[PDB]
């Protein structure tokens, strides 16, 4: 329950060799769950 | 002797001649809601020829040559074996795309149903049909009026009757493939189920 304050933040993949880790969860779930649903929970911006 | 007997029978041909048309019926009656009676006797007697196999496949060897035969004759009826595969496949994903949350928020009626357009837009978005699949599920899918369709009759509506053939065929292929180890023919079958 904790980690959940990290998942929209923009700062999420900080201190990590991987940044691209929210687009490739996009990408893998995005079909099933939903776009729109990943982008908010991540807070992405799917034009940006 | 009596299953080198019938190994060396014609019993082969009849099994072929027996998935051809089973194929094809089950695919001609699963669109018609009046025939469903029809097509679940259709599929006890298919789960019997399964088990006819089962018996032939019992107490062999690995490399054995009635599980060659076996695999050959499965490659002689390709085209139907995927039909069937495809058949069973593509009605089990369908309840789970059903219960998914992207179908829950494309759909709008309140009354439970959903009209065909909407329908189609909600697969094309779920990305794992093609689109004569979505074709033969949308003419599978009866609508009552203006095109609703309820998903949820129509989801639960396959998923008894096919069970037993399903879980037949699987156990089927597994026996072939733990038995006849190095084979590529028999690893088509087994990505496409």
Same mark, same amino acid.
């Given at each position: ?16 060799? &991987? ?25 992405? &911006?799917?034009?940006? | ?7 060396? @029978?014609?019993?082969? &041909? ?26 679940? !006797? ?7 020829? /399964? ?19 076996? /695999? ?34 494309? /759909? ?32 599978? @899918?009866?609508?009552?009026?203006? !095109?609703?369709?309820?998903? !949820? ?17 699987? /156990?089927?292929?597994?026996?072939? @493939? ?16």
């Amino acid at each position: 329950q904790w980690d959940r304050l990290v998942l929209n933040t923009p700062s999420f993949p900080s201190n990590y060799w &991987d940044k691209f880790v929210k687009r490739k969860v996009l990408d893998k779930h995005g079909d099933i769950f939903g776009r729109e649903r990943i982008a908010e929970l991540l807070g992405m &911006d799917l034009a940006s | 002797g009596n299953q080198q007997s019938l190994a060396h @029978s014609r019993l082969w &041909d009849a099994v072929v001649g027996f998935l051809h048309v089973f194929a094809h019926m089950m695919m001609k009656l699963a669109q018609d809601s009046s025939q469903i009676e029809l097509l679940k !006797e259709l599929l006890d007697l298919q789960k019997d020829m /399964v088990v006819m196999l089962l018996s032939l496949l019992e107490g062999n060897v690995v490399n054995g040559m009635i599980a060659r035969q076996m /695999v050959d004759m499965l490659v002689e009826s390709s085209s139907n074996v995927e039909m069937i595969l495809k058949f069973f496949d593509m009605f089990l994903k369908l309840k789970d795309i059903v219960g998914s949350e992207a179908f829950q928020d494309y /759909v709008t009626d309140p009354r439970g149903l959903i009209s065909k357009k909407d329908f189609q837009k909600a697969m094309d978005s779920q990305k794992q049909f093609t689109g004569p699949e979505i074709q033969f599920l949308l003419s599978c @899918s009866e609508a009552d009026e203006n !095109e609703m369709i309820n998903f !949820e009759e129509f989801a639960n509506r396959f998923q008894e009757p096919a069970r037993d053939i399903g879980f037949n065929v699987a /156990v089927l292929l597994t026996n072939l @493939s733990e038995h006849v180890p190095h084979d590529p023919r028999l690893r088509n079958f087994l990505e496409l189920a």
